[PDB]
Amino acid sequence: VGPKQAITSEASTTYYISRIYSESLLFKRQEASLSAMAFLFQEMISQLHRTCKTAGDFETKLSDYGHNIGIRLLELLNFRASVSNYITKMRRRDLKILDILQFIHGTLWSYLFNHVSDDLVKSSERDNEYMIVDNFPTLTQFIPGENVSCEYFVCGIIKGFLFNAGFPCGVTAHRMPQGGHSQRTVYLIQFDRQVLDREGLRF
Amino acid sequence: RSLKAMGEEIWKNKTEKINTELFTLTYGSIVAQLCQDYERDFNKVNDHLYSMGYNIGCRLIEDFLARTALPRCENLVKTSEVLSKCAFKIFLNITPNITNWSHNKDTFSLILDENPLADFVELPMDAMKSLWYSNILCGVLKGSLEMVQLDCDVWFVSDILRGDSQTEIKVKLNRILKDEIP
Amino acid sequence: KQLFVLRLLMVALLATPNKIAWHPDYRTLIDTIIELLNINSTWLILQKKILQLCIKVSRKINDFEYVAKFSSILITKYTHLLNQSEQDALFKEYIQPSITNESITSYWDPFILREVVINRILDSDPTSNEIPAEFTCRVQNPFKFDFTINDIQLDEEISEFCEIDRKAVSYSGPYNVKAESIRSITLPLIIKKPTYKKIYEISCLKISILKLPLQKFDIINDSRR
Amino acid sequence: PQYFAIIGKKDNPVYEIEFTNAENPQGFPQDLKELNPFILHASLDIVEDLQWQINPTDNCYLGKVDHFYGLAITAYISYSGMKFVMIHGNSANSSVVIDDNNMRSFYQEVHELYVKTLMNPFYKITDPIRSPAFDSRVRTLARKHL
Amino acid sequence: AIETILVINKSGGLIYQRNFTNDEQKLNSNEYLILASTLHGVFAIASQLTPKALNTIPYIPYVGMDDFFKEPFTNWNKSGLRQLCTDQFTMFIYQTLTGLKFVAISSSVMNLAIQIADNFLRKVYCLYSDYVMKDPSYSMEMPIRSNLFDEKVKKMVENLQ
């Protein structure tokens, strides 16, 4: 079914079971050490400070990895949570913004980091801006986070959880020590006006 | 034995563990961006991901010897095969198997039974010939054994997803002096 | 759905055996068929079919700059998916009425000349430069071959001659090039002249294919100077 | 005489295929070109303004949705972005037969074949699939449910 | 009891210095580097005295209230300087297999006395190799500018005394 070729094929009156590579896809558990994945992230950030010029382009050239695999984690995390495959059903999709940022809050962190980010605060002054704070970020706990440029793996990974969801969204991170919990990072996200106005048709 | 049992013991300690799916997805995204960026130069992504592996090969062994307080590895083959057989399982929970020696067990192989770097990758048809998917292990093992002063020479010879049925790494050990003052 | 029903309107205009001279709303009808797409979508075979319908309307209603415009945009932006079947062999007959008109210029492909050599031919024993990758040309004959990629025949190369440099200019080219292949060329024949000797570079030269004289068709993937 | 499409987010068909019953032994001769993208292009229009509302609890599967003047169409919307469309029907009869549950056990069943190909990290979004195996799998997966 | 900790890299140079609880200073940076170069020079020759002219393990008391590994471990430092004692302080040394030397100098006196200050120094070598080894600002064999390292060893001075 090539782009150059047409949609042409042949009749159904045979049976070609000559298949090679298709397996299970279930939730396996192998649980590698945080030192190993921390070294993987470590030499990745070393490559990005090698090859890139300044602050903002490095921030984008970090968040593109999250945009690579955010779509991928979205669709089978939803296919495991809201649903081989002797399937009962697939449940509801994104209704609005407040179920899908509950869906990061419910079962994305507990898919990744075995806990839950502690709040999902709807903002005071506006509604296009939303804010999630992780309390003690797991994959960047060793980096001295005075530059906050090193946590844009996870701003990239949630932006690709919402760009498939139809909400294009400016996603930023800041870090603010509001509690005795130190080095908690706020992901103050935004949206665009238009799917806010698609929410703003009826709410 | 002693070492074999304390591998499963020292799996249970302070710094927490996270699921291998994130680690696999991060590695797949890095190798996909580097395969896209160098315009399908699969030779160049091999040595770039090799140096990517070696630059944490320089820094893995300090965390290995700190978190696993272990003595000097005086035998250069049999202690080496049993320490790597527990020492993947301390970092990424896998138990490779060791066969295919020299006459003096010098260029020994290390068959990995199942690979978590590519559980689910079907690498494309142009990328059959001049690429191995996981040469970061050939980076990090050569670094991690050069810092104990053992001039190894690892290379892949076969994997799963280039077509073959076994995943193994052959390694020539040259020799190097001046460890420390003991 | 508006594009579906307007496609049926256009196929109603093809199947009608009544006769039409052009009405100044078919401007906007064919303009809005094109701008219900974003074409100046990545469903390319749809673009092949909807441009074939626009070209057949513009034949039947005879708006010759629009059959010029939209068939030039069909040939440029497509035809990796057009072999000698799916009416490309029964096409290009549809645009010799464009070129026997004054409609299209410039020969749309900016990838024609594959390389340039001015390789020599030895005649005498020691009539050569015995004391002085430049050339410093010796009185001989060149050869600069090209490729076509559009698999139609009849691209008659005429008047292949050089740019705004000296009297080293090519003579004549009265034969054609082939349908598919990278065809070798016959006799450019520079009529070179002793001038002052300072270094003068070429990049390419003008070519006309039954048409207006172009500019220097810059060689592929490189200078190849 | 059945016609599968997977059509993407920016209107690109990432997988599109026909097949035929040998009891028809061909498919829609002279109708195979109007029952292609334009009908499917309007099907993208109706699933575009049918997905984002709750109401015209199974948000993914939608069943039979519309009808041009020769046949009728069915649909499916995934949260991956993709909108699966099968186009079925013998060309003589107006084919009424929407099985609605056993071909619901096709759309959630072809979904994982899209999943494992999406999980190929060399595979991008917005590019079609020349898998020689996943297209031979689906006709035999349609040998389950004709 | 310990009031200043250094670490040394394997090529004979200082890496880190913190005069933790002494709080009157006269030493700036490069005199501490003169100490680092001279202890590397001493530790060069301080094996080949061989005064014999011809299994020892450390132990587990749980210093630093968990710990990391509750076992009487080995040590690579079979021939060389281990500790010193003078009338105003005492000093300690722990090497790795790789080559990092891990100084601790204590003003008071604190057999068992080497062993408690060995059991402290495996912990900070674990803490070195988790908190500035995993740091992309840390280029190799440079000083330590992780403030996250520095309070987490400043906490372990009061987790000693």
Curated annotation (Swiss-Prot), chain A:
Record has Hydrolase as a keyword: no
Against Pfam families, the record matches this protein to: TRAPP (PF04051)
Classification via PANTHER family: 41-2 PROTEIN ANTIGEN-RELATED, TRAFFICKING PROTEIN PARTICLE COMPLEX SUBUNIT 5
Principal cellular location given in the protein's record:
Golgi
The protein's name in its UniProt record: Trafficking protein particle complex subunit 31
What the record says about family reads: Belongs to the TRAPP small subunits family. BET3 subfamily.
What function does this protein fulfil? Component of the TRAPP I, TRAPP II and TRAPP III complexes which act as guanine nucleotide exchange factors (GEF) for YPT1. TRAPP I plays a key role in the late stages of endoplasmic reticulum to Golgi traffic. TRAPP II plays a role in intra-Golgi transport. TRAPP III plays a role in autophagosome formation.
**Compartments it resides in:** Golgi apparatus, cis-Golgi network; Endoplasmic reticulum; Preautophagosomal structure
Question: What biological-process GO terms show up in the record?
Answer: endoplasmic reticulum to Golgi vesicle-mediated transport; intra-Golgi vesicle-mediated transport; macroautophagy; retrograde transport, endosome to Golgi
UniProt KW Transport keyword? yes
InterPro entries linked: NO_sig/Golgi_transp_ligand-bd, TRAPP-I_su5, TRAPP_component
Q: Name one GO cellular component term.
A: cytosol
Assembly: Part of the multisubunit TRAPP (transport protein particle) I complex composed of BET3, BET5, TRS20, TRS23, TRS31 and TRS33. Part of the multisubunit TRAPP (transport protein particle) II complex composed of BET3, BET5, TRS20, TRS23, TRS31, TRS33, TRS65, TRS85, TRS120 and TRS130. Part of the multisubunit TRAPP (transport protein particle) III complex composed of BET3, BET5, TRS20, TRS23, TRS31, TRS33 and TRS85.
Curated annotation (Swiss-Prot), chain B:
Q: Which domain of life does this protein belong to?
A: Eukaryota
Q: Which InterPro entries match?
A: Bet3, NO_sig/Golgi_transp_ligand-bd, TRAPP_component
- Pfam families annotated for this entry? TRAPP (PF04051)
Give the location in the cell. Answer: Golgi apparatus, cis-Golgi network; Endoplasmic reticulum; Preautophagosomal structure
Q: Which GO terms describe its cellular component?
A: cis-Golgi network membrane; cytosol; endoplasmic reticulum; phagophore assembly site; TRAPP complex; TRAPPI protein complex; TRAPPII protein complex; TRAPPIII protein complex
Keyword field:
Autophagy, Endoplasmic reticulum, ER-Golgi transport, Golgi apparatus, Lipoprotein, Palmitate, Transport
GO BP, one annotated term: intra-Golgi vesicle-mediated transport
The record's section on CDD domains has: TRAPPC3_bet3
- Which residues, per the entry, are lipid-modified as S-palmitoyl cysteine? C73
Instruction: Describe the task this protein carries out.
Output: Component of the TRAPP I, TRAPP II and TRAPP III complexes which act as guanine nucleotide exchange factors (GEF) for YPT1. TRAPP I plays a key role in the late stages of endoplasmic reticulum to Golgi traffic. TRAPP II plays a role in intra-Golgi transport. TRAPP III plays a role in autophagosome formation. Required for sporulation. Has a role late in meiosis following DNA replication.
Q: What else is known?
A: Present with 2370 molecules/cell in log phase SD medium.
Protein family (similarity comment): Belongs to the TRAPP small subunits family. BET3 subfamily.
UniProt-recorded name of the protein: Trafficking protein particle complex subunit BET3
From Swiss-Prot, chain D:
InterPro entries named among the record's database cross-references: Longin-like_dom_sf, Sedlin
Q: Which UniProt keywords apply?
A: Autophagy, Endoplasmic reticulum, ER-Golgi transport, Golgi apparatus, Transport
Q: Which GO terms describe its biological process?
A: endoplasmic reticulum to Golgi vesicle-mediated transport; intra-Golgi vesicle-mediated transport; macroautophagy; protein-containing complex assembly; retrograde transport, endosome to Golgi
Instruction: Please indicate if the UniProt record lists Transport as a keyword.
Output: yes
Q: Does the keyword Acetylation apply?
A: no
Q: Mind naming one GO cellular-component term on file for this protein?
A: phagophore assembly site
**One Pfam family of this chain:** Sedlin_N
Main subcellular location of this protein, as a coarse class: Golgi
Name its cellular compartments.
Golgi apparatus, cis-Golgi network; Endoplasmic reticulum; Preautophagosomal structure
Family membership: Belongs to the TRAPP small subunits family. Sedlin subfamily.
Q: What does this protein do?
A: Component of the TRAPP I, TRAPP II and TRAPP III complexes which act as guanine nucleotide exchange factors (GEF) for YPT1. TRAPP I plays a key role in the late stages of endoplasmic reticulum to Golgi traffic. TRAPP II plays a role in intra-Golgi transport. TRAPP III plays a role in autophagosome formation.
Assembly, per entry: Part of the multisubunit TRAPP (transport protein particle) I complex composed of BET3, BET5, TRS20, TRS23, TRS31 and TRS33. Part of the multisubunit TRAPP (transport protein particle) II complex composed of BET3, BET5, TRS20, TRS23, TRS31, TRS33, TRS65, TRS85, TRS120 and TRS130. Part of the multisubunit TRAPP (transport protein particle) III complex composed of BET3, BET5, TRS20, TRS23, TRS31, TRS33 and TRS85.
Swiss-Prot record, chain E:
Query: Mind telling me which InterPro entries this protein's record contains?
Result: Longin-like_dom_sf, TRAPPC
User: Further remark, if any?
Assistant: Present with 3130 molecules/cell in log phase SD medium.
Would you kindly state one Gene Ontology biological process term found in this protein's UniProt entry? Answer: endoplasmic reticulum to Golgi vesicle-mediated transport
Write out the function statement from the record. Component of the TRAPP I, TRAPP II and TRAPP III complexes which act as guanine nucleotide exchange factors (GEF) for YPT1. TRAPP I plays a key role in the late stages of endoplasmic reticulum to Golgi traffic. TRAPP II plays a role in intra-Golgi transport. TRAPP III plays a role in autophagosome formation.
Q: Which residues form a coiled coil?
A: none
Gene behind the chain: TRS23
Keyword Transcription appears in the UniProt entry: no
Give the superkingdom in one word. Answer: Eukaryota
Q: Which Pfam families match?
A: Sybindin (PF04099)
* Subunit structure comment from the entry: Part of the multisubunit TRAPP (transport protein particle) I complex composed of BET3, BET5, TRS20, TRS23, TRS31 and TRS33. Part of the multisubunit TRAPP (transport protein particle) II complex composed of BET3, BET5, TRS20, TRS23, TRS31, TRS33, TRS65, TRS85, TRS120 and TRS130. Part of the multisubunit TRAPP (transport protein particle) III complex composed of BET3, BET5, TRS20, TRS23, TRS31, TRS33 and TRS85.
UniProt keyword list: Autophagy, Endoplasmic reticulum, ER-Golgi transport, Golgi apparatus, Transport
- GO CC annotations on file: cytosol; endoplasmic reticulum; phagophore assembly site; TRAPP complex; TRAPPI protein complex; TRAPPII protein complex; TRAPPIII protein complex
List localization entries: Golgi apparatus, cis-Golgi network; Endoplasmic reticulum; Preautophagosomal structure
Query: Is Ubl conjugation given among the entry's keywords?
Result: no
Alphabetical list of CDD domains matching this protein: TRAPPC4_synbindin
